[PDB]
Structure 1
Amino acid sequence: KKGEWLPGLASPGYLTGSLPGDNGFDPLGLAEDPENLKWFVQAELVNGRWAMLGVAGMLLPEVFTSIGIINVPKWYDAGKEEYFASSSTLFVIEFILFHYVEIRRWQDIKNPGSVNQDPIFKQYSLPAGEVGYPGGIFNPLNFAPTLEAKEKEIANGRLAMLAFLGFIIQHNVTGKGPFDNLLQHISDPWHNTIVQTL
Structure 2
Amino acid sequence: GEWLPGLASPGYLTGSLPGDNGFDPLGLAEDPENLRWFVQAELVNGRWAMLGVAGMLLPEVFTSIGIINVPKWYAAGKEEYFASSSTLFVIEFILFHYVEIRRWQDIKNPGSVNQDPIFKQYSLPAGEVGYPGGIFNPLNFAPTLEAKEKEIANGRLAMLAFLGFIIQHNVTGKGPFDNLLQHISDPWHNTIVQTL
For the aligned residue pairs, the C-alpha RMSD in angstroms reads 0.7
How far is 1:85 from its partner?
Answer: 1.2
Q: Deviations over 1:110-146 (max 9, x none)?
A: 0001110110112101110010100000000000001
Q: Deviations over 1:24-66 (max 9, x none)?
A: 0100011111111111100000000000000001000001011
Distance 1:107 1:61 in 2: 35
Could you tell me which of 3, 6, 27 is aligned with 1:8?
6
Superposed structure 1 runs of 4+ greater than 2 Å apart = none
Distance 1:99 1:9 in 2: 42
Give unpaired runs (5+ residues) of structure 2. Answer: none
How far is 1:86 from its partner?
Answer: 1.1
Distance 1:76 1:154 in 2: 26
Distance 1:82 1:25 in 2: 44
Distance 1:12 1:178 in 2: 36
Q: Deviations over 1:140-182 (max 9, x none)?
A: 0000001110010000000000000000000011101111100
Distance 1:34 1:144 in 2: 27
Distance 1:116 1:71 in 2: 42
Distance 1:106 1:190 in 2: 48
Partner of 1:91: 89
Distance 2:172 2:40 in 1: 34
**What is the TM-score when the length of structure 2 is the normalising length?**
0.99
Distance 2:187 2:38 in 1: 39
Partner of 1:102: 100
How far is 1:23 from its partner?
Answer: 0.4
Distance 1:40 1:141 in 2: 28
**What is the TM-score when the length of structure 1 is the normalising length?**
0.98
How far is 1:81 from its partner?
Answer: 3.8
Paired residues for 1:33-52 under 5 Å: 33-52=31-50
Distance 1:33 1:120 in 2: 37
Name the SS of the counterpart of 2:34 in structure 1. helix
Give unpaired runs (5+ residues) of structure 1. Answer: none
Distance 1:11 1:193 in 2: 35
Distance 2:153 2:76 in 1: 29
Identity %: 99
Q: Deviations over 1:81-132 (max 9, x none)?
A: 4211111010000000000000000100000011101101121011100101
Distance 1:58 1:130 in 2: 30
Distance 1:81 1:174 in 2: 24
Distance 1:128 1:113 in 2: 7
Could you tell me which of 175, 188, 191 is aligned with 1:190?
188
